Unconditional design. Structure first.
Ligand code: ADP
Ligand code: ADP
Ligand code: ADP
Ligand code: ADP
Ligand code: ADP
Ligand code: MG
Ligand code: MG
Ligand code: MG
Ligand code: MG
Ligand code: MG
Lengths: 371, 371, 371, 371, 371
């Protein structure tokens, strides 16, 4: 039979079937609830809205994200979202399709324990498996060597792999991703007089960010150019017809990835994190790691991010080494693509967590069965 | 020489001289214009009235506030008010006294740019400086550690400071202040048959609010007590001799600070905003922030507001931490007091924005010179 | 006159006077610098903090260790720390007191060359000397026979001595010490949901480790016991009032000493290193080495480390030999104690590196004068 | 038919066919096993790697040498290496080719007994023979008189032969060879800040040693020259792009052959060992031994070793005697060359240990059949 | 007064006083010097160790024998040993006690000349005398007829005496003694995997030899028995706790006395040497020589040596003659016993070499005064 692949990200939900080349269902990972009082009678109004329906009537709802920083904080909302994916989007019965789930490294173990418990108790999937997203990204890339820089909506992590062997002591994690960039853009848009406060306005700011932001090759020169001329200014139209203009905020927002101190964080940029992860590996494998930098996730879709990353890593690495940044045009769904590839493998079918094993071993089977 | 300190708030204007302990001039920040047709000849009537004069003949004028939400919307009226303060109230020549101005955080930059331009072009002040009101409140408090909750007439903001170092990523702003409370009281007074519509009636309602309103320690119990008995009812006399009676509207109006949903806002209460600002700071400085909650502004003068804030924050913070709310009896003028203290410092005299620097660097000198 | 003894470790600084039985000054070897922007004026804030002062205001500073793995990487910070020790802690003038310094074996020679250059040029000490820390530990033990296992914050080394004669071909070194254990504990605390990232949080994790960790006599049995029951779980209170609970991480962290593969190292455990060092010595001196195992350093202060070491070495050594582990209660300062003992010897005064010898022979005099 | 010649050294394996002038297969004598955890599925990864394959993926493996000091310590690994040589390198069937093996003198007898047992039981060679490596070196030299100084990777031995007659009472052995030199170079490279610890780093250090080391004609003068000038310094590039610089360590490493006390050994140098072996022979044969010093093995390939040996022996021997050191350019494979020559002799075919003799006489036939 | 008797052997020193029945001081004839570098200060370490003190700290010293083959090769070490005997062992003043010394026959004359010169110049003995050790052995035996077979540590000699008359043309000498046996045992212990190389390991091997070796009555039958069964195998415990097992090496080592070709010597066995010495005497004295074979020295203390000697000589001598081997249980000190007996004789006091005779006749007086 066919197996389901679900990539439960912080912001988006990517669901589909193993063997396909693109997710069947992609929609925001939000749940909305009304915040006003209803006066019409017989409208058949619901008490909650999930996905694109919540984004539709977002002017009267309060939107909540069940996942923050790759960690599920609301489990009732997560069950609602999983039910939505399984019934109203994929339109399948989760009793005959094994389901493949993803998770960021260095997460709490209770997260995956509860994921397995919900999958086997609330739903009746015959088997399930939890895979590291960077491994799936490297599967999608078609290679078995390289360090993967995955940046989605909640977390950013690096995982180096040499010959199918992972070096877990060199895995580095960062709680700086797209949502922090959206909040920073919201904060810095107030300098021009634009005030976005509500969650619906947060969605507006997210759309502005993902439609008008880019990474500058040289930050100081770009700031000087923006200050001098006005060619970098762009206009955006609000839903009510108002037009706002954005100048240096276009590239000041993605700059937080390379200078996390813009949002009060002491951590290092993504380039320095990648270099530190590489330098924690064996000296004989560093050359192949320098030439196989793989990027994945929505936050890696900014224009000019790959060139900036290559420039920074070249400035860090020695001159003799060759630095290659591998950013496929479909890296926004590379985790799901690799998950589908892994679930479609003939030799992978012996590593599913079957129902009998879960019943005999409790929810702790996931730790020993899954890396 | 002596330097001027001007606290241009949304509702009130606090002006005076550095080194004093109280503002010299305090008057409403309104400009009035006649709305009827004159029949007497030779009365020497003016076309505009500023300050207490407008409040005197408010039965024949239309009153306008030049500032909404800490942002100056009318600049001709603001110039009129500044001229009033400099000539008819302080009775000084603004050419030999440096002037210290205040501004709320996260305001548009054009606001302070135009403030500097007006101060250096319309008037001829030798130097000027713009300071954050929360920093001045902490100066007045006599301490260099703590989170300040300033609530005036247009805005409410929180600014945490540990050892003279501000954490700008933890600053939170709220466009809910005294004017919204006055509008809400006007709206809810119609339930008893009292209809106030005009701007002069808005001043009447503001006086009723600031003379008869208080914050309830427990809102539901207070509502039950008001419904059961009649001891909470108070009487107010209108200018024409009519007497109105107010019941649960006395504490239903200030409750909007802790439940902003009463006026259709999705934001969180002041207690939750303070807790969120504290939790955005470093873990090693949170203990000193919990014990140094400083309140300032006119909107913090409601009876029982400090006890309610302490109760809510204690309910939010862990049991081991000690919560102290610092509400001095003179917190209505603490911003001006701190501004005077800062302007009277010997080591502060090197940070004035002199006329030559403004001339060479344009109106953009304020951003680099002032935090 | 009196001579100074300074034990410049990776984590701690132990300074004092020769002839005493305890260091006069002990404080962390860190330098902190502000990472936020200051708003108060006239606070007299400094640009750097050294020692306990940095640990005080660690919520607003970035902390750096000038020494990694017993090698000084930052020399300006090291000069700052030495100035701190000489002036603000010992309160003496380093021009009439000869200073005794310590260093780990198999260090770069430029390290001690620059140490001598700084001591004779930046300061004006009349004489100085560099001693191996294991020799000082054996001096403190009061015996002249035995192999010393010194483990501080950056390095772990073994040095066997028979009759005052060292066997340098049997000296073994290991770059696994307390800082690696702190990093491993930080990494494995994320499994329970606790995220410590900043340097101040690194200090928090170090305190948790040194107040709640121990060495298990049998690792697998301890893991089984921790999995079955909950008697091994302990609670710790964070500075902000939050309480965290630690289970098997209490003994999983010190286990890295005996199984260095937990942090991706191919090296052997401390017991195997000690056995290999003993087996590299002459057959006629091995019996006295088996019965004189001396431990020193802070990393040797874990509960149950001595019993585990004895058990492992007994399992390695032949049955007839007698294994004794000598772990005095004051082994945390045994290097300093032995240095004081050596500096107080009457027959040692002829081996100081005087100023004239340094002037005539350059900084290379340390190699020929010191072992 | 053709007979196989296998020179199982400590570091290298030299295999081929009798009658040829060069070994067919030369590769390191190592077996590698993974030390990390695999995450890719379907890679077809092996559990062990032998030879150059282990040297390829050495950044993720732990490398072990089955032979130390000419003595086989691991027999499963030795069987793996023999299978590799017989199948993946020579690509022959070891059932119709008699195999000639080599062994150092004064080895344990169980070593050759087990070699014969493995050759006749695990494989089915029709016949086999064990020859002394010095005799094969003298065969390759084309002469039947002289003392042979063979130094490979584990052992160094001297064997004097006059007219085809060996003097076994004058054979001298030394457990100081290339591996000790590699370990010493690793130890003394830490003085410049370079730290090599892992087995792969041991291979790196071995490459540095065999590409940058030489024997100084006069050690003290060379040390003075290296200290004074900098013309003796050379640079080496690490696999990750880092560049290291080596000074007097180039000739300080090979000096251990003439001064074994550098690594804590009480033995005498190779020159003194050769002189002592010569002086243990009859007085009438010493003159021909002085003029037929033959060197063999990889450790004899250092530049300037032959001149130094001649100088030392001339200083030891009387003035009238003539000292000649015979170091052919192909002495790295002279043992294999002599073994091929011996196996290709028509008169040697009667001294093979046939299968019937082994079956009737047990594994002890090797002692009586082979010298 | 009392006279001193000193038996300066190759391995042992036997000193005492004339008239006693056992030597007062017996200790090894070695001098040790440190070979490592000292790190402790104030240990009062010496630069040389003599006797049992050298055997104590032999794991850090290099041991040298001043005497090889009964010939003194190092004279500074010999002076050190003589000073040790005279002061730290006998505790007497060598100025009032005449000293009796011993020497092997057919030694260089310069040996005894320098012995006399040292005794009369470095020390101030009133008189001295050099006696042949075989004559002293025959004195100890209490008879004046017979051939003496003395075998110590360096030499083996035969001296036949008939009626107090020596036949110097029949004296035979052999440079095969205990030290050669120790070296042979060291060489043949490598066949079982035991490697002893250092001088301290030479002492270990000497102890093993003198505690586990014996002479086989029939060598070939003993070899067959050892090969067949395992009852001849014995175990020995090394100082570090390791246990070694010795089989046919127990009797293969003493066999070198009867088959000197085992160590590459062309000479004849001790039995054949004794027979040849007897056959060089007059035919009328051979019968009394056949029946008075006297053995002395440590090398004659092997079990079964006397029976083997009797069997061999009986096989050589004609059937009618009666062969008696006289091996007293105290033959290890028979030379010293006979020297004491000779020095205690009243009629011997006229043959001392007085100081005046030495002064007038130079060091050559010993040749004419002593046989
Ligand atoms: N073209 C784009 N440019 C910049 N940011 C983008 C773009 N597309 C998506 N993003 C950001 O990436 C995030 C989605 O990343 P995704 O890979 O779905 O994360 P997750 O794996 O956690 O679901 C969104 O928050 C969005 O703001
Ligand atoms: N005693 C009081 N009780 C309740 N509200 C008050 C009281 N005094 C003043 N206010 C309110 O506070 C506002 C003035 O606050 P102020 O600090 O002057 O604001 P700003 O700093 O913007 O001028 C007025 O709108 C008034 O309604
Ligand atoms: N009681 C304890 N238990 C476990 N670890 C400890 C204890 N006390 C100190 N340590 C660790 O030992 C280190 C200090 O060791 P120290 O001997 O000062 O090293 P150094 O000689 O390099 O200064 C610290 O990093 C600390 O984490
Ligand atoms: N050109 C060279 N210079 C110095 N050392 C070398 C050189 N070539 C090889 N070696 C050393 O010699 C050793 C190989 O010697 P080899 O004769 O193969 O020993 P074996 O007979 O035990 O296999 C290696 O360990 C290597 O370090
Ligand atoms: N019981 C014994 N069995 C075998 N050999 C012995 C025994 N006792 C001593 N020896 C050997 O005899 C030697 C000592 O002989 P000794 O008579 O002291 O010689 P010397 O007269 O030259 O000092 C030692 O080298 C020792 O190895
Ligand atoms: Mg994702
Ligand atoms: Mg204000
Ligand atoms: Mg230390
Ligand atoms: Mg070889
Ligand atoms: Mg003797």
């Amino acid at each position: 039979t066919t197996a389901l692949v679900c990539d439960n990200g912080s912001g988006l939900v990517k669901a589909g079937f193993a063997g396909d080349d693109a997710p069947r269902a992609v929609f925001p990972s939000i749940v909305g609830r009304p915040r006003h009082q209803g006066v019409m009678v017989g409208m058949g109004q619901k008490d909650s809205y999930v996905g694109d329906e919540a984004q539709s009537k977002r002017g009267i709802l309060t939107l909540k994200y069940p996942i923050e920083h790759g960690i599920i904080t609301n489990w009732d909302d997560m069950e609602k979202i999983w039910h939505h994916t399984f019934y109203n989007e994929l339109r399948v019965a989760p009793e005959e399709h094994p389901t493949l789930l993803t998770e960021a490294p260095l997460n709490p173990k209770a997260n995956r324990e509860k994921m397995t418990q919900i999958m086997f108790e609330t739903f009746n999937v015959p088997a399930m498996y939890v895979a590291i997203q960077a491994v799936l990204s490297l599967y999608a890339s078609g290679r078995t060597t390289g360090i993967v820089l995955d940046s989605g909506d909640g977390v950013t992590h690096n995982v180096p792999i040499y010959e199918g062997y992972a070096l877990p002591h060199a895995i580095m994690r960062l709680d700086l991703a797209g949502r922090d960039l959206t909040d920073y853009l919201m904060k810095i848009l107030t300098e021009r007089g634009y005030s976005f406060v509500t969650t619906a306005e947060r969605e507006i700011v997210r759309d502005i960010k993902e439609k008008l932001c880019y990474v500058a090759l040289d930050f100081e020169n770009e700031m000087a150019t923006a200050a001098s001329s006005s060619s970098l200014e762009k206009s955006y139209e609000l839903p009510d017809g108002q037009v706002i203009t954005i100048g240096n905020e276009r590239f000041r927002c993605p700059e937080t990835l390379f200078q996390p101190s813009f949002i009060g964080m002491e951590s290092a940029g993504i380039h320095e994190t990648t270099y530190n992860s590489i330098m924690k590996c064996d000296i004989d494998i560093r050359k192949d790691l320098y030439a196989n930098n793989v990027m994945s996730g929505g936050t890696t879709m900014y224009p000019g991010i790959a060139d900036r990353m290559q420039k920074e890593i070249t400035a860090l690495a020695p001159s003799t080494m060759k630095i290659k940044i591998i950013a496929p045009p479909e890296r926004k769904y590379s985790v799901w693509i690799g998950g589908s590839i892994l679930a479609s493998l003939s030799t992978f079918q012996q590593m599913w967590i079957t129902k009998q094993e879960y019943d005999e071993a409790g929810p702790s089977i996931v730790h020993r069965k899954c890396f």
